[PDB]
Amino acid sequence: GADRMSKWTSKRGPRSFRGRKGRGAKGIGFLTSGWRFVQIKEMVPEFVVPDLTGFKLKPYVSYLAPESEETPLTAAQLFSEAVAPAIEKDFKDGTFDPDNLEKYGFEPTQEGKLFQLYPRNFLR
Amino acid sequence: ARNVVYPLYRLGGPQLRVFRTNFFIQLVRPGVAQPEDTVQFRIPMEMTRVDLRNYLEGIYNVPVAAVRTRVQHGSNKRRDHRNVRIKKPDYKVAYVQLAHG
Amino acid sequence: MKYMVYPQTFALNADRWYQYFTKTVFLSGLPPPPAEPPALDLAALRAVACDCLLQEHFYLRRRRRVHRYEESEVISLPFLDQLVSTLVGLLSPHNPALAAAALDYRCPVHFYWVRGEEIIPRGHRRGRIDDLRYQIDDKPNNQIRISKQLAEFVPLDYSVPIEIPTIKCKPDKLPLFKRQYENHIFVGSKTADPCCYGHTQFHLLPDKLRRERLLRQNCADQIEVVFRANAIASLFAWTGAQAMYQGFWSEADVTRPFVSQAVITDGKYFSFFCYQLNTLALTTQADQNNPRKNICWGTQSKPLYETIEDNDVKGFNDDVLLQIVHFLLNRPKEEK
Amino acid sequence: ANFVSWKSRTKYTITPVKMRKSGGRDHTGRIRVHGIGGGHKQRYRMIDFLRFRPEETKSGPFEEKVIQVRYDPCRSADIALVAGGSRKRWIIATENMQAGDTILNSNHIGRMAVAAREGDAHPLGALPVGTLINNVESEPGRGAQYIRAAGTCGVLLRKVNGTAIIQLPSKRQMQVLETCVATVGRVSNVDHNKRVIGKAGRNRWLGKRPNSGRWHRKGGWAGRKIRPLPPMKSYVKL
Amino acid sequence: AYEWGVRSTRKSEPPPLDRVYEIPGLEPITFAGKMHFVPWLARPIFPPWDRGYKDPRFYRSPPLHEHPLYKDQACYIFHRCRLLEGVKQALWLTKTKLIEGLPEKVLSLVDDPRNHIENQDECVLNVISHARLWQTTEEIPKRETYCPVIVDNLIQLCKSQILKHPSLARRICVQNSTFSATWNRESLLLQVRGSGGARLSTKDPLPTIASREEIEATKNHVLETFYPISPIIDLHECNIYDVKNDTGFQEGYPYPYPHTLYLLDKANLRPHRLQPDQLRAKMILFAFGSALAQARLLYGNDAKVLEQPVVVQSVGTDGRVFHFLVFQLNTTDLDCNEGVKNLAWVDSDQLLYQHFWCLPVIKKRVVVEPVGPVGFKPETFRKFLALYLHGAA
Amino acid sequence: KARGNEYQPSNIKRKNKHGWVRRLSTPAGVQVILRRMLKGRKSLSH
Amino acid sequence: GLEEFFDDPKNWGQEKVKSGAAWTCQQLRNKSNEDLHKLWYVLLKERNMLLTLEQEAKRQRLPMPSPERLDKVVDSMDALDKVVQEREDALRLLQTGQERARPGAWRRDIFGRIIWHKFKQWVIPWHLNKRYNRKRFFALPYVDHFLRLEREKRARIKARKENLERKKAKILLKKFPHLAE
RNA sequence: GCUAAACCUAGCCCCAAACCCACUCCACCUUACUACCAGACAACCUUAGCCAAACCAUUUACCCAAAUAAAGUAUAGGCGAUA
RNA sequence: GCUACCUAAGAACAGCUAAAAGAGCACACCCGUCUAUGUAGCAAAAUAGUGGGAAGAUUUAUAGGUAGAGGCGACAAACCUA
RNA sequence: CUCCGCAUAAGCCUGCGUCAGAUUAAAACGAACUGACAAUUAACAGCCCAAUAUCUACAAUCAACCAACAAGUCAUUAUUACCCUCACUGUCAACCCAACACAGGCAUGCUCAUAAGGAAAGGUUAAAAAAAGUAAAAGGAACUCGGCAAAUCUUACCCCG
Ligand SMILES: [K+]
Ligand SMILES: [K+]
Ligand SMILES: [K+]
Ligand SMILES: [Mg+2]
Ligand SMILES: [Mg+2]
Ligand SMILES: [Mg+2]
Ligand SMILES: [Mg+2]
């Protein structure tokens, strides 16, 4: 006689079931003795909101704007724009070696950084 | 944020920070008489009352004293022409009380 | 089903709502002293209060770490227990009534009453009249009961040009929740106990309502609300329960006022209140033509001390200690 | 099934232990023994059947004081709380064991037999022939496994080549090494077999369920059989 | 011998190791690279894991022998210890002689009717009725409830006599205080760790009870032994301890002298309540511990007969029965069994009342017994009051 | 006496008896899910 | 303040509110990350206001003024996400070479299907994780028959679809007989 | 005169050919679709029977890797049915 | 998830007589002796009255165990989703 | 009239709130049906616990006399580790299991007759037969297989267990 098709939610079942199931909210702490919840400040997402004073970009764009061709950014294009100029300049100077690749911005390992690209350890 | 993985926290680790939040909220007119200082919202299901306090204060600079939330059941009673139940989506309601009179 | 009214409440501006439920007007300051026709050793009293304060904070050695969340129960609660115990002992010569008074520790106080009516909005009982019922379950850290009633602060017909605040929505929005359980009217002891009157109550605010946390939640203006709400609710229940022990109720309103005093503290800041119960006729029927109002007097909370460094109490405030003593020196008027 | 034996405690204690009934079911959940179920709840008091267990740092004969003799729900015989040194333990009480008595747990076998006091534990080699004994073990150090029920007693019959011949309550002889320790006297509750149940309900309190109503025709197994006493059972290896 | 713990309940033994490991020069292909179990690959041998950082909720303590305070000699620690032999065991442990009855000095205090409380009998009866009946909303208050309150109210009743005796204002009743004292008996290291109950603290030490002639007359007394039971039975044999001697308060406490120790036996269940002899034994050891801690503070850690004996009192009750103890510490040279001995005056089994009826006993619509105390004995409170008045009146 | 009311709903029992985890705990139960997956059942289990 | 949840008070009740275009991926690709970070919140506040107005319109049973405004804001915010994601994806490839931010692996499940198992974060190693080890990342032989039956089910569906298209192509030539070329 | 009647598409079947097979973010073996903890359990093992033999008891065809032919032949079998 | 039996940890049993109780009278509660009604019915086993028990081998809520060549059974060839 | 009723648990999942539709409740323009819009806000409840060793003989019943057997729901210490705080979820209804808006099934607390909750008659007529009751001259089991049923409140036996 049970409804098999409807979504299983925390509203259904006995008291123990209803309190164990949630709605997808991420936890921000743990329970201690006596069912006392300890909130961790570091676990609460901190909204990094910028100052918008004197910001000239608005929600919409003017219709009298010239159309341009879509060119998605690629790793090659980023390397050419950011890394290639410095490598070309040091090549002409005559002082270029693989040891100095960190100078040009290569990161041998992601460990030890606050924002690690893989595995990604930061929020959108 | 929603539909994202949260970096796991360990004792002594960095503060968790969100730079571009995808939580969107809508201020709604209360259906019943409410106190003068009370503001009603419909927030995402994954947004906690702690998030809403920091969300309103950080982005809107609204001083919040208290936040209460509840989960409203959306009706699953309606039936389409195929006699298949149509689910009105569930939504979370928040009650925000202003902090300085 | 009745509303659960908590004297110690996290609800914002709860004092205004509690005034409505109890038909209590609040007045700033203490009641007007009566003009009517042994030496107090301030030095001795101050030393006992500093001794108790230093005992819990410093001298008494703790076997176990005292964490911040445990400080209220482990440190503050013994202080108020001992502070009340010693002071009444030293003040027995000045006040004979104290010698025969009953000193309770964390004893329940219950009051149940009906205020107002509502039309049932939904269900098979929709559209029918239902009384709005209320219940206060309070546990004063300490209290003092006496066998003779204290004198009224003002006349029973006392009138003030101050209206009782009204609420334009349901009590549920405070928030306030309903529950059904035993309706208890209890002063702290059963009716057989001779000590059926109330002298002074001492309340300790819980850690959840600590001053430090209210400031962090943008609730600086609720600090005094928390004290006032606890005073109004606690003393209304206590004096109300006392009146009903004497046979009074909504249809047989009190023929004399019932007064009591409360000391509200969080362990450092102390606030002093006096409550006079002038009427129990709070139902819609009995309140239709009721000019009486209940009165509550309250002072702003003041720190008893500034800091405690090692075994030194810095900035001890004698005025706060004197105010505690003045309540403990109150006694019933002796008949001829 | 998910049956887990309650007999999980690993450290000896005199605190009564919560025990779980079986209902005559095995670990599979199927009935293995019929006629078991319900009854009053009981707690298990751990009985030490090795009377000669010296304390951790001690050795040799030691004495214990009887603190209390009391009812045990888990067995027919009464049990006695005894204390010696810094240790307390449950043991089976003898017929005349009472609080305040002192008992002697020795492992010494001497040229002459000791004067056997009821409730004392001695090696079988040290006891006079004909002594009434109880709580007898098959091999030295194994622990008492025989003559443990209320009122039961054995008799030391012979002592030959470092061995002792005992008569079991069933009257079948039992050869053991003379170093096997026994307790002198009869087990407590001599009148256990005289109890009257009185009504069906009392058997239910004891955890016994009624017999099947199925009528079974008796077969050749039934009827009196006069058989010789079985040959002496021997635990000594030659 | 029978071994406790059936094998089916014990941790299952590790499955047999794959035979590829046995073959030398062969590298087993395991599922470790796959990061999950598969039935057709070999079980990897995982190296032991260490978290490498502090997680208080997942802490594991070091092995017991590696603790800094681990000592090879055991210290037998005595509020939850229940002595098998009761007072006799306590008398031996504290090298004290027992005199039956309270000291005449104490009992004379209440023989003067000027020291009696006004309406004493009615006042005490109300205290019993309050604790046993009028206390709560529940019909029948439980012992965990009325036992603490009946003692508090009786102390409050005695504290009403500050009017007659101004010296009663130099004492306070302290809660949650603890004390520790360590001493040696026949080479056995003993420690009492006191906790629970109320410590009545005075600014002035209690007058000595026994003259120097009675103290010297204890040399003849021989401590009774109770072979085969050890004097240390039912004590906590501890191999990780510190030789702490503590009064429970830091130096400078205005009320440093222990006057009375109020010990409660408030457990609702009878098997969880100390027997009368066991409660008296706890009182003796706690009184001795408090006295010894004071002596070690005032007169150093040396072992010597004390020129100024330390007197400490104790009142033990379960809510109805009251025990009274006056303990005098005459010596700290406790290792020997011979010499000056301590003195303890003990008045046992003092019933304040026989029974209390919370409901009327009605047989055939006739109230056989009314509600209230049955068999109230005012003498019991007179001894309670005398102990309180001691050192003030 | 009257029949037809054999169903006495209990979420704990329903989940334990017919739930996803229960089904996967044995090879026969896994095959139940596979048959229902092959038929295209919207509800593979309770 | 709370006024930012509502449109300009002069626009209340207007049948139409004119709006500009949605930001395009190319236009946003010229802006710095800091500018895009600020623009996100500018677009975010506009989105909340438009969502507030949409709900109030339903409450009042009135049409929403200029409903295309909401679509534009969503398109602009979707473009901003894509632009920022592209920059992070390119940087990850250069510094790590990994095509996905989240670790994962191809796995076979208890039902014999090949699945991409996205990894989760844990504090203890996998060999000690009791719940993780209860999961079966392998299929036993009894699954083989079902895999074939499922493969054959797919083959039948695909065969019907292909045959139907051919039938439809012939029906088309019948109606329009000039498509022979 | 009502109720009705009438329709030609949706798609489907059998062959041929060709090996087959996924993917947005997030969730999902615990009570699946549940962010976040100390475990270690692990897969294989003859189908049977209806039925035919007019009962039934030995026995009674089941793709197993080239259409055809050798051939329903050699051979097997309560030398029966049949294989 | 019915039912038979079992396991874990719970709950209920007024009043009167006797005061000892698988004791009596008698509610709640459990059961279903006899009659009538009903018989596609209110019900694929009910209703009304009358009855048996009602501190016990009692009744009962919750979770769990035993599965068909079987289980369970104070044997009625009972009961194991009409 | 009052069988109840109110609340909790379990179950159920928006299932008589507002606006509008003439869709319909075994009748009916009110609506449990349709569409749209609302709503249940934690203090109650659920969701708990660092490690190793060690501790835990003495029921309950007003727990006091007294007597028991079927022998019982409630307990730590030592050392190490530990600064942090109020998140998340349940909260609606005239409701559940019986194909139904079914005279059945359905745990606990309180109320012990109610302050709560309800309506046996669509209108008429007043034949038969049928159902449920009430009263009855004289007689009093003559009825019937049988004192079944009803009324009344009873004596003495027998068989079986
Ligand atoms: K027994
Ligand atoms: K029915
Ligand atoms: K429902
Ligand atoms: Mg909530
Ligand atoms: Mg047994
Ligand atoms: Mg038999
Ligand atoms: Mg038989």
Ligand SMILES: [Mg+2]
């Ligand atoms: Mg069915």
Ligand SMILES: [Mg+2]
């Ligand atoms: Mg059931």
Ligand SMILES: [Mg+2]
């Ligand atoms: Mg055949």
Ligand SMILES: [Mg+2]
């Ligand atoms: Mg046949």
Ligand SMILES: [Mg+2]
């Ligand atoms: Mg059981």
Ligand SMILES: [Mg+2]
């Ligand atoms: Mg009864």
Ligand SMILES: [Mg+2]
């Ligand atoms: Mg009976």
Ligand SMILES: [Mg+2]
């Ligand atoms: Mg009866």
Ligand SMILES: [Mg+2]
């Ligand atoms: Mg019959």
Ligand SMILES: [Mg+2]
């Ligand atoms: Mg039932």
Ligand SMILES: [Mg+2]
């Ligand atoms: Mg049966």
Ligand SMILES: [Mg+2]
């Ligand atoms: Mg038969």
Ligand SMILES: [Mg+2]
């Ligand atoms: Mg038959």
Ligand SMILES: [Mg+2]
């Ligand atoms: Mg069936």
Ligand SMILES: [Mg+2]
């Ligand atoms: Mg709570």
Ligand SMILES: [Mg+2]
């Ligand atoms: Mg409700």
